Amino acid sequence: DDNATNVKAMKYLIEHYFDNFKVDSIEIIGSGYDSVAYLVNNEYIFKTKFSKGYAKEKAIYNFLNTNLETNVKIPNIEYSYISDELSILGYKEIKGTFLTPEIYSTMSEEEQNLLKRDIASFLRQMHGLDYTDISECTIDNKQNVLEEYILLRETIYNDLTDIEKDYIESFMERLNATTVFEGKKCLCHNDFSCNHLLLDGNNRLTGIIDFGDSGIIDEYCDFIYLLEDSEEEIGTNFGEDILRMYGNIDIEKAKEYQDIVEEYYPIETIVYGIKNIKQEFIENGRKEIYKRTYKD
Ligand SMILES: Nc1nc2c(ncn2[C@@H]2O[C@H](COP(=O)(O)OP(=O)(O)NP(=O)(O)O)[C@@H](O)[C@H]2O)c(=O)[nH]1
Ligand SMILES: NC[C@H]1O[C@H](O[C@H]2[C@H](O[C@@H]3O[C@H](CO)[C@@H](O)[C@H]3O)[C@@H](O)[C@H](N)C[C@@H]2N)[C@H](N)[C@@H](O)[C@@H]1O
Ligand SMILES: [Cl-]
Numbered sequence: 001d002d003n004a005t006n007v008k009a010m011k012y013l014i015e016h017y018f019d020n021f022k023v024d025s026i027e028i029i030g031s032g033y034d035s036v037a038y039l040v041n042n043e044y045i046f047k048t049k050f051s052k053g054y055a056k057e058k059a060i061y062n063f064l065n066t067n068l069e070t071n072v073k074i075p076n077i078e079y080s081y082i083s084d085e086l087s088i089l090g091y092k093e094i095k096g097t098f099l100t101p102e103i104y105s106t107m108s109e110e111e112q113n114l115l116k117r118d119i120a121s122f123l124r125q126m127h128g129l130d131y132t133d134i135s136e137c138t139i140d141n142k143q144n145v146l147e148e149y150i151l152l153r154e155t156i157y158n159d160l161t162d163i164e165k166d167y168i169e170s171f172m173e174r175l176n177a178t179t180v181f182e183g184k185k186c187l188c189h190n191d192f193s194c195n196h197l198l199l200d201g202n203n204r205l206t207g208i209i210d211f212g213d214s215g216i217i218d219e220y221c222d223f224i225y226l227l228e229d230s231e232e233e234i235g236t237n238f239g240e241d242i243l244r245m246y247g248n249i250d251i252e253k254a255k256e257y258q259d260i261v262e263e264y265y266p267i268e269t270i271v272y273g274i275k276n277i278k279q280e281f282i283e284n285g286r287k288e289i290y291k292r293t294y295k296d
């Protein structure tokens with residue numbers, strides 16, 4: 001019994017904290033580096049974490065369920081337990097199939113267009129919300145990076161190689177010269193990748209999950225994965241078309257914003273390692289810097 005034990009513990013905690021909730025079945029459906037999500041009674045999702053723990057995400061679902069006008073479904077929190085050492089959010093599973101590159105490639109041109117229009121429409125509607133009632137949830141990525149650079153300088157920066165230092169400094173120089181943080185701010189999903197997008201039986205967008213990183217931030221943020229060229233995402237043209245449908249936005253700046261975030265990735269990974277005292281992340285990030293430096 002490996003997998004069997006985690007599930008038992010979480011079944012115990014769910015029943016203990018949610019007085020009249022009976023767990024008849026429970027399985028792991030996903031996990032991050034510091035969280036685990038479970039499917040319970042083939043009906044409920046329970047996102048859990050042993051903290052930095054789930055209060056903001058819940059506030060955002062509550063704000064969005066009150067204010068969004070859309071047929072696209074999002075989580076609606078029925079159960080929550082939030083404490084310093086433990087957080088749990090429960091909601092009814094949104095039913096559907098996650099969008100993937102393989103699926104997209106089987107769709108007709110028209111089906112692809114309609115999906116793109118759906119996404120644009122959802123983003124336009126969310127970005128247009130008056131965010132006053134969630135004003136607390138502001139995120140300044142540039143300032144966050146500066147603070148993370150300071151933490152590097154205070155911890156391991158001096159032990160890095162010249163090549164690692166150069167990569168970091170060359171990123172900081174670019175950050176200082178860019179104008180992409182100076183545009184429209186709005187409420188963004190802020191992790192808007194196709195593993196969070198659900199399709200219904202006609203390949204239309206039916207739901208969106210994981211607003212855990214959402215906040216008032218640069219409008220460009222919600223396009224960075226839609227613009228990404230990788231195995232996990234659909235491709236740059238997909239993001240471009242969505243941008244054109246969404247309208248009133250500088251595409252070249254959206255791409256610059258995406259490229260800068262991408263350049264930061266290995267540094268983000270290093271910083272996560274430092275803050276969470278996980279050496280393997282520090283090592284992975286540094287190695288990634290070498291791989292990027294040597295790519296022709
Ligand atoms: N079909 C379906 N799957 C969901 C739903 N909610 C969660 N999941 C599944 O559970 C996984 C984990 O959920 P998610 O919100 O993305 O959280 P996380 O990124 O792992 N954790 P965190 O946001 O704390 O870093 C998703 O990849 C998906 O497999 C839902 O409503 N419907
Ligand atoms: N799983 C490996 C992939 O990681 C990154 O992309 C994923 C992404 O990871 C972030 O990407 C940023 C750098 O672009 C960072 O902030 C990451 O945290 C994740 O947050 C999204 N929900 C899904 C994205 N596909 C990379 N962009 C991509 O090139 C790479 O293939
Ligand atoms: Cl290391």
Ligand SMILES: [Mg+2]
Nearest residue numbers: 191196209210
């Ligand atoms: Mg997720």
Ligand SMILES: [Mg+2]
Nearest residue numbers: 191210212213
């Ligand atoms: Mg998340």
